[model samples]
Target: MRIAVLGLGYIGLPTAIMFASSGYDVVGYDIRSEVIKKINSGVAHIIEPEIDRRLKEVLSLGKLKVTDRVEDLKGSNVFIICVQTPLSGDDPDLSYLERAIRTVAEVMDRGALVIIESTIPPGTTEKMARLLENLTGLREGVDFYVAHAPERVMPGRIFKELVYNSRIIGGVSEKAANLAEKLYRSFVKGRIFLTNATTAEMVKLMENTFRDVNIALANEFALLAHQYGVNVYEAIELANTHPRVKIHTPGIGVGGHCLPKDPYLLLSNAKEDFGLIRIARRINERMPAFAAGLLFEALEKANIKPSEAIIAVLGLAYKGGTDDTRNSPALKFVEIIRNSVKEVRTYDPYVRGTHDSLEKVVEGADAIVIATDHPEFKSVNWESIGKSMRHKIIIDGRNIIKEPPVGFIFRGIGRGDV
Candidate 1:
């Protein structure tokens, strides 16, 4: 099959490369000319495991091609839309997806399959099918096919998850579902569940919503543990031993593209009030401020004035071992504490924009705050940092740091015993 994947972004580029390497003639379509040039030269824009090797192999074998023009993909048998669906003031902004569908409508031949791999609101696949019919004068499900298979993968482990994770293919018709199943069977090793369009959309949203709500409950437990002068981590460990409770860990705040926005998407179309989800969102959203307040308290305890306090933020990415900073709570905490402190230095080993050296981030600082739980943060040379910094107060927002060097004051969320 000649498959055309739209929007060579974080999700699109990887999906396109995977499809091409799996013996399909894949054309990666994007409006960015520079991206097209880079991909044609066997270069990948995003950092995902196994992508570089796979992309190079596909480009050399003539299995994958890239283009900036929509006309170039007119003869493809399948068109998969992977454009972004960011929010615009609490609602999904579907302009990118709309434009992509319109482009496909213009170029796609009769009997071509159109699959939306982007995460979207429920009923969007059917709505877009109608839109395509109006634009191309082709009846959906008879003349063309539409399906929704939301991109379900993490940044670092995208390649593995793409192949192994169970996928949902929600099609507008039974024929559409079967066609999508045949396409994915080329590369997907995991089981593919077939259903209607709206159910698959709701399934993806509910997965993320489930995580966000559970994380909110964990954050609330952290607050309660703080008031009771107990360690929340220990309590969680004990409670989880019963096998019925599986509580998530609390962090400074919830970040990333999925967890923070999925709850809002779920609540957007609801007819009645959703009190618990809304409250959970409020609790997780306020955690950055709460972390900043803890920093202020640490400053007071050390007898360091705001004018004399130089704080070093340990990580900037929303998660560990990846450079994605879409809605990082680390950035939010910096914004809240920057004005109050004399100086603030941010560093993340994975993110290219941060400080170059760990010494530079820690030198002459009054305190260090661990925002993201990068694996490297655990093995940092705290003994050296203690000697260089003016004070040795460590505020661990993620609570991954256990024991600092001998002369450091360690304070963390949900661990009042420290």
Candidate 2:
């Protein structure tokens, strides 16, 4: 089938590649002409494993074409929408998705299958279907079909997870669900569960909200650890010895495209306020401030004034081994302490345009704050790294450092034993 994948972003590009690789005539569309040019040249703009190889493979087969012009997307049998739905304040913003649907309405012919792979609030798919009907004067289900197939792939493991992960497809009509399942089976090796659109939307939100609430619980436990003179990591490890307990690890904060915002989306359409979800969100949001407090404590221990401290923040990416920093807590921590500290230097191996090397990032700085849990940071010989630091102060936000490096004042979240 001819498929048009809109957005050409982190999710869209990969999904388009998968469809093209499966021998479909896929047109990857984006408003950014520069992105269109880049993709047409067989290079991916995002950093994901196997993306470049797959993009090149699809380009060689002449199966995938990218374009900015709406005319290029004409005669597509399927439209898979993969645009972002970021939050404006606390509400879910659907401007990008709305614009994409407008594009689809303008070009999509009869019997087209429109699938929204973007995570959105419940009831959005049905509303979008009505919008297309209003614009094109086409009957729903008979003239065109719509479905919500929320993506569940991680940033670094998109290709593998895309193939192996179990999928949830919610259709406005039974025909839409059946058609999406049949088409997605081209590359989806895992199980595909069928449901209605609103439930599928809620399923995606609940998945992230579950993790957000659990992380908030862990963060609350970490807060108590500071009071009780306990190490939360150690305590959690012991607590998790029981089969029933699967506690998530607490960190400086929970950041990423999903966890930070999905909970908000989950409650966006509700008439009444949700107590537990909102409360958990507040705890997670305040974690950066909590991590900053730990940093200032380390600064005080070293007899250095906060106003005179030069801090090197290691890992700007939200998590390790990936450059997707949509809602990274590291940025929040920096903002919390930016005015208080004399200077801040950032270094993420994956992210660009920061300090070049670890040595350069930490050199002459009063403190090194581990903001991200990059695996590379765990292997660094801090003894050697501490030699050049003007004041060897270490604040571990991700709990990567097990033992305090000698000759450096060390402070870590939940490490009250120190």
Candidate 3:
């Protein structure tokens, strides 16, 4: 079957490559010519683990093709819309999904399967099916099929999780569920659970909301720990020894497209106020400012004025090891510090071309803020970095650093001055 995958981005690219390498003729459709050229040339626009090698293999085997033209996807039997569902204020901006659906409706043949792998609001898939029927006069489950199978993978391990993670297929009809399940089975090694479209959308939202709520609790605990002069990380780590208690790590803030935005998406669909989720979001949202304040405190402890401090902000990505900076707390933290400090330099190995050299970033700096918990940041030569900085003060935002060099004033998020 010829599968047309829309939006050649992080999730879309990997999904397209997975289906292509798994013996399906996959045509990746995107609006960006640069991304299309990169994929067709066996290069991925996104830096995902195992994606480069797999993309090269698929391109060489003639299984994966890419195009920026809607006309190129005309004859495909399957249409999987993996476009982004970003927010406008608190509500989801479904304009991308809408345009993708319209494009698919114009090009997709009768009996084609339409799968939405984008994380969307509940009832979005059924609404798309209705839209398709109205636009193309094609009855869903008969002339066409629609399903909601949101991508449930993280960055850096997207390729492996795409195949191994258990999937939930929510269909507009029984036929839609079965078709989506069969298509995903071509590459998905994990179990596929079938359900209705709305339920599936809710599952994805719930998954992220669950994390957001837990992270907020952890963030609150960190604040409480700060008040009580206790190490929140140490306390939580010890308390988690009790079975059935699993608390997430507290950080500068929740970042990326998922945790920061998904809760709002779920809240937008609620008929009543989702007080818990709303409060959790506010807590996480405030953390970047809290983290920034820690840096100011560190500089003050060292007798360095904010106007005299040259700050080095390490790790720009939301998560460790990948360059996805969408809603990253590190970015927010930098913005906060930039307004006060003499100079604020940013660096991330994964996010190429956007930062300064490591030596340049820390050189003559008064403090270094470990914003994202990238592995490289953990293993930095503190002895060397300390010597380069005017004041050997490090603010551990994610609390990944354990050992500190002698004579350095280290401040961790949950741990009071160490």
- Name the top TM-score candidate: 2
Give the per-residue lDDT of model 3 (tens digit) for 136-239.
98899899999999988988789889989998999999899999898899889999999999999999999999999999999889988887888888889998
All models, RMSD in angstroms = 1.5, 1.4, 1.6
TM for every model, in the order presented, reads: 0.96, 0.97, 0.96
Candidate 1: tens digits of C-alpha lDDT, residues 286-399: 999888888889889989998879999999999888888889999999999888888889888888534777788888889999899988897888888889998998888887
Q: After superposition, how far is residue 360 of candidate 2 from its true place, in Å?
A: 1.6
Stretches of candidate 2 exceeding 4 Å from the true structure: none
Compare candidates 1 and 2 on lDDT and give the better one.
Answer: 2
Off by over 4 Å in 1: 352-354
Compute the lDDT of residue 21 as modeled in candidate 3. 89
Clashing residue pairs in candidate 2 are none
1-418: candidate 2 lDDT, tens digit per residue: 7999999999899999999999799999999999988887777988898999999999999999898999988899999999999899978999999999999999999999999999999999999999999999997789999999999998889999999999999999999999999999999999999999999999999999898999999998988998899999999999999989989888888888788888999999899974999999999999889989988888888889888889999988889988877789999998999999899999998886269789999989999989899988989999999999999989888999897888888888888777
Residue 363 lDDT, candidate 3, scale 0-100: 82
Quote the positional error of residue 94 for candidate 1 in Å. Answer: 0.7
The lDDT leader among the candidates is 2
